[PDB]
Automatic annotation (TrEMBL):
GO molecular function, one term: hydrolase activity
Residues of the AB hydrolase-1 domain: 25-301
Keyword Hydrolase part of the UniProt annotation: yes
Organism of provenance: Mycolicibacterium thermoresistibile (strain ATCC 19527 / DSM 44167 / CIP 105390 / JCM 6362 / NCTC 10409 / 316) (Mycobacterium thermoresistibile)
PANTHER family to which the protein is assigned, alphabetical: EPOXIDE HYDROLASE
InterPro entries the record matches: AB_hydrolase_1, AB_hydrolase_fold, Epox_hydrolase-like
UniProt keyword annotations, A-Z: Hydrolase
Keyword Hydrolase tagged: yes
Alphabetical list of SUPFAM superfamilies matching this protein: alpha/beta-Hydrolases (SSF53474)
Protein name: Putative epoxide hydrolase EPHA
Length: 319
């Protein structure tokens, strides 16, 4: 009995999944790339049973939500205010913001941008990082140069990764979910120069992952077959702009109660290191690395991620 309703927020309309009773303390769930409010399916009833009001939107560019053709429509200020308008919708002064992946970044930036609204913040996979001195695309070409292959740089030029990922949504989703690995044979082959795509570079698993059924996987493929992948890709196309937009929080800090939580095997921690997370998250902080877990953490280790979320949330002032 999780419900869904259309919600008008921040000049757009999001498909909202929610469960529990309004008035109960509010916990917001912000998915990531290329994911949906469906990716919190195992979390939501837990959080409900734990006494919370849960909200899980398809974020702008995904699912049943608005998908502006404009790229600037996807910058960080847009995506955070999107979420705060959910609080507004029902009169909520503050809430707990939980995010996996791009969602995590969104919530981290939310803590800094709406400190008044954010009672607690949790980010999965992607850690608190201090604002770089150089714009990320500069940082990343510094890191990998201009001949090697690197996906986030591959996603910048509009159209190109879009065609690739749209071309075969099934291949995309199955290699995304089953093919993401920190294996060094793979890494080497992902990086190597040449014309091949990201999904091309990805391994294709023989059998389904143990944590993911056919039905579930089919759902993702369906929705992204309907929507395409441009909406989420346009989140990456805003990194430099989001860097400009946030100059004014270089000395700003998260004093809110924080939790960081990742599969120890998540590929993105190689260039999204969590060493300096306490430079940003200066209130209560906690790191949880899950041994042998990779990227799709809430889906892979659901009871574990439930228990950490629920225990993080027990005892906090969220209302
Ligand atoms: O790119 C990902 N995260 C991210 C978000 C913002 C900035 C940098 C990285 N995750 C990801 C998920 C699936 C495949 C590849 C990457």
């Amino acid at each position: 009995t999780p419900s869904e309703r259309s919600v008008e927020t921040n000049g757009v309309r999001l498909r909202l999944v929610e469960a529990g009773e309004r008035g109960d303390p509010l916990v917001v769930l912000a998915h990531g790339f290329p994911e949906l409010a469906y990716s919190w399916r195992h979390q939501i009833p837990a959080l409900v049973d734990a006494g919370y009001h849960v909200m899980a939107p398809d974020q702008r560019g995904y699912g049943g939500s608005s998908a502006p053709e404009a790229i600037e429509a996807y910058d960080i200020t847009r995506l955070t205010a999107d979420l705060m308008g959910l609080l507004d919708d029902i009169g909520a002064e503050k809430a707990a913001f939980i995010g996996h992946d791009w969602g995590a970044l969104v919530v981290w930036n939310a803590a800094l941008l709406y400190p008044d609204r954010v009672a607690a913040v949790a980010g999965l996979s992607v850690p608190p990082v201090p604002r770089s001195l150089t714009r990320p695309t500069e940082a990343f070409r510094a890191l990998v140069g201009e001949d090697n292959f690197f996906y986030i740089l591959y996603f910048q030029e509009p159209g190109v990764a879009d065609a690739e990922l749209d071309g075969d949504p099934a291949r995309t989703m199955r290699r995304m979910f089953g093919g993401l690995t920190s294996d060094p044979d793979a890494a080497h082959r992902m990086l190597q120069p040449g014309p091949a795509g990201f999904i091309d570079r990805l391994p294709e698993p023989e059998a389904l992952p143990d944590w993911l059924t056919a039905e579930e996987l089919d759902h993702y493929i369906a929705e992204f077959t309907r929507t395409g992948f441009t909406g989420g890709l346009n989140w990456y196309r805003n990194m430099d702009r989001n860097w400009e937009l946030t100059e004014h929080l270089a000395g700003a800090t998260i004093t809110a109660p924080a939790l960081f939580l990742a599969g120890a095997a998540d590929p993105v921690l190689g260039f999204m290191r969590p060493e300096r997370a306490t430079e940003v998250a200066v209130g209560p902080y906690r790191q949880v690395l899950l041994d042998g877990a990779g990227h799709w953490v809430q889906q892979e280790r659901p009871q574990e991620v439930n228990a950490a979320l629920i225990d993080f949330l027990r005892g906090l002032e969220l209302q």
